């Protein structure tokens, strides 16, 4: 970051700076970057889990322009307004992040079936949604949650929601927030450095889920990039105060 | 254990040992043997309980090569990837273990029927799955959970999951982890020394369950055997970083 007061050489008289409005309305300050990143963002809104697959993959990365919808492109399972959230706009300014993320997963059920959430560390790939690992047609005898990796279970009859905190299990000092083109086929090891692992949800029977994401307490951002080129048309969908 | 520094007679100059990476990424150390054995392993993935039987038997022993699947052999109720878990690989190095094991049992139900989990001490047998004790055709009037043995109940409507800790109720100083051949008919008293008892799950009506196992807090391993002869084909099911 460069403040730019360096370039301001003028030292002539000016009007008063006044008094801040911070604290006047309430003490609930919402200016802290970490506080903004720690409140949740909806990734997946009522998406299906299918037991024919290994599970629904969630790549461990914060919300950003990487998950932004553009009118015309192919339809994904992602929430369309991820790119327009405050924290996504903030993450578009910082290309480095380190620490844990927290995932709030809600299973749309009240059944006694256990739904397992398995953490995969940084393996070098980057996938999302339902996937058959090594293209098999049977995963009940070889579940991902019973392979050895760290796992937690949801029992909807007790509690359909859970909040799980995924560690920074990677080789790199920082995780890369975004690329210029997310679908470009470049150097394969660099391609996978935008995630720190995966979170895999596996059901017993067919059931829907919703997924939110936020930053952990142990979390930092760095490598300030400044604001990008942007567009808006908010004016057009509202009346003015003069009819 | 023999470190083998004994045999290293050379005392010439060497390059620097450097500084450890332990603590750099996180303080979550995962090198402790006890810590690895204390995180759970999936034994049975959605297996049926039938009230026509006495109950589903679980032999009290940690995960190891004893529960390893081999392509071609007869189909069991066991999870296929038990042998490839970290803790199973660790237990293949130690042939002695003493202390308690902890069993996480999840009943796939939300009903008000009580499902009883009975502990049997070391009796000299070794069985698993559904069994009719003394080959009778009626067990509601003579349940195993109401014979005198220590028992705990699961009420799925309240909580479909439970964690129960089974004691080291045996004659022997140590329990034997594994044998060279698990199906060999040798001296019958020695044959049963690989378990410290059984855990028997009995329902009211037909229902499915899932079972995990881990080491207790009061738990030790000993009699280090070193690494066995092994095989892998992991390379074949992955692309390299050069396409």
């Amino acid at each position: 970051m460069d403040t730019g007061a360096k370039e301001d050489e003028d030292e002539t008289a000016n009007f008063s700076d006044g008094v801040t409005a911070m604290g006047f309305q309430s003490l609930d300050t919402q200016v802290s970057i970490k506080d903004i990143l720690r409140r949740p963002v909806l990734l997946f809104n009522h998406v299906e889990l299918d037991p024919d697959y290994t599970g629904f993959f969630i790549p461990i990365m914060p919300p950003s322009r990487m998950m932004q919808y553009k009118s015309g492109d192919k339809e994904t399972s992602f929430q369309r307004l991820i790119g327009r959230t405050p924290q996504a706009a903030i993450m578009n300014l910082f290309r480095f992040w380190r620490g844990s993320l927290r995932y709030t997963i809600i299973i749309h059920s009240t059944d006694g079936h256990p739904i397992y959430v398995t953490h995969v560390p940084h393996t070098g790939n980057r996938v999302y949604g339902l996937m058959k690992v090594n293209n098999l047609h049977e995963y009940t005898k070889v579940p991902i949650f019973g392979c050895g990796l760290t796992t937690e279970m949801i029992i909807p009859s007790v509690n359909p929601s859970i909040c799980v905190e995924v560690p920074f299990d990677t080789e790199n000092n920082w995780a890369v927030t975004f690329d210029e083109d997310a679908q470009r086929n470049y150097s394969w090891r660099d391609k996978g450095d935008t995630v720190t692992g995966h979170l895999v949800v596996t059901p017993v029977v067919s059931v829907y889920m919703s997924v939110w994401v936020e930053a952990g307490d142990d979390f930092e951002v760095s490598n300030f990039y400044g604001p990008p080129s942007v567009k808006t048309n908010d004016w057009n969908y509202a009346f003015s105060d003069e009819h | 254990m023999d470190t083998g520094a004994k045999e290293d007679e050379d005392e010439t100059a060497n390059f620097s040992d450097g500084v450890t990476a332990m603590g750099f990424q996180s303080l979550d150390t995962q090198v402790s043997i006890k810590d690895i054995l204390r995180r759970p392993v999936l034994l049975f993935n959605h297996v049926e309980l039938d009230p026509d039987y006495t109950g589903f038997f679980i032999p009290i022993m940690p995960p190891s090569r004893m529960m390893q699947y081999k392509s071609g052999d007869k189909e069991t109720s066991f999870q296929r990837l038990i042998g490839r878990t970290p803790q199973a690989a660790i237990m293949n190095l130690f042939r002695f273990w003493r202390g308690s094991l902890r069993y996480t049992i999840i009943i796939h139900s939300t009903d008000g029927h009580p499902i009883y989990v009975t502990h049997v001490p070391h009796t000299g047998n070794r069985v698993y799955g559904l069994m009719k004790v003394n080959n009778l055709h009626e067990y509601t009037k003579v349940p195993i959970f109401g014979c005198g043995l220590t028992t705990e109940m699961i009420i799925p409507s309240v909580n479909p999951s439970i964690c129960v800790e089974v004691p080291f109720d045996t004659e022997n100083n140590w329990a034997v982890t594994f044998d060279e051949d698990a199906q060999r008919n040798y001296s019958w008293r020695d044959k049963g020394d690989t378990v410290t008892g059984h855990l028997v799950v009995t329902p009211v009506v037909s229902v499915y369950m899932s079972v995990w196992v881990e080491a207790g807090d009061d738990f030790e391993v000993s009699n280090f055997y070193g690494p066995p002869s092994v095989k892998t084909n992991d390379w074949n099911y992955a692309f390299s970083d050069e396409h």
Binding site: - | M1, D2, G4, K6, E7, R65, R95, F96, N172, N173, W174, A175, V176, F178, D179, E180, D181, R184, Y186, S187, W188, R189, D190, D193, S222, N223, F224, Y225, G226, P227, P228, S229
Partner: protein, 239 residues
């Protein structure tokens, strides 16, 4: 530790080990495994009556059968193996006074020491490894390689230098005592006379020069450092 100049009887700087009425010398240096503990505390509970030692008989050196190493022998090949104490009672050195207490007592705890003496010439070369596996009954055919031997308590023998090797073996068994002898009246439900296995394996094959010897020999010697016996009975022949 340090050699001297040649005299009437060569380089007279030998070391030796005296145990009871038996002595074994060594021309070169020796390798010795770590002194590691056995299970203690269960002895007083397992046996209501006091246990007995016979150091004069048991703690002496006793040689067992000779081992031949050839140029044909490959890495990982078993040169010899011993289920102890069984094989030291009714296979090797059967007339040894070390075996006398095993005739009368039914139970015991046993800590052993095994010395290995090799005699290959200076134009030969090769590596042999001896290791111990505790409580090996129905687990002899697994974790039984050179790699498993290098992990477990072991000694390494170079076949050219003729360095001696001493393996210190504690009592590490899943029961309090090991049974000494089988009998017609006794149960067949428990395997007796085996709390451990000893393996002698080729680490690197024996090699020789042009018109050289195609084999050489190794001799094991055993002794009990701590043999406590329990449960007196009428004397029987061993196996």
């Amino acid at each position: 530790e340090v050699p001297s100049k040649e005299s009437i009887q060569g380089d007279a700087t030998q070391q030796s080990s005296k145990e009871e009425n038996t002595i074994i010398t060594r021309d070169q240096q020796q390798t010795v495994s770590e002194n590691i503990p056995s299970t203690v505390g269960d002895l007083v509970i397992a046996s209501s009556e006091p246990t007995q030692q016979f150091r004069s008989l048991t703690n002496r050196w006793m040689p067992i059968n000779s081992i031949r190493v050839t140029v044909n022998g490959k890495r990982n090949d078993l040169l010899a193996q011993y289920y102890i104490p069984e094989d030291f009672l009714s296979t090797h050195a059967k007339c040894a006074p070390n075996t006398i207490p095993f005739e009368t007592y039914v139970y015991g705890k046993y800590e052993l020491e095994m010395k290995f003496v090799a005699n290959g010439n200076k134009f030969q070369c090769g590596k042999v490894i001896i290791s111990v596996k505790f409580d090996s009954y129905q687990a002899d055919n697994i974790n039984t390689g050179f790699q498993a031997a290098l992990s477990r308590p072991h000694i390494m023998l170079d076949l050219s230098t003729n360095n001696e090797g001493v393996l210190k073996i504690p009592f590490r068994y899943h029961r309090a005592f090991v049974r000494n002898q089988t009998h017609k009246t006794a149960t067949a439900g428990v395997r007796p006379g085996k709390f451990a296995s000893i393996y002698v394996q080729v680490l690197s094959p024996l090699q020789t020069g042009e018109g050289g010897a195609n084999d050489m020999f190794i001799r094991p010697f055993y002794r009990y450092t701590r043999a406590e016996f329990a449960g007196m009975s009428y004397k029987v022949p061993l196996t």
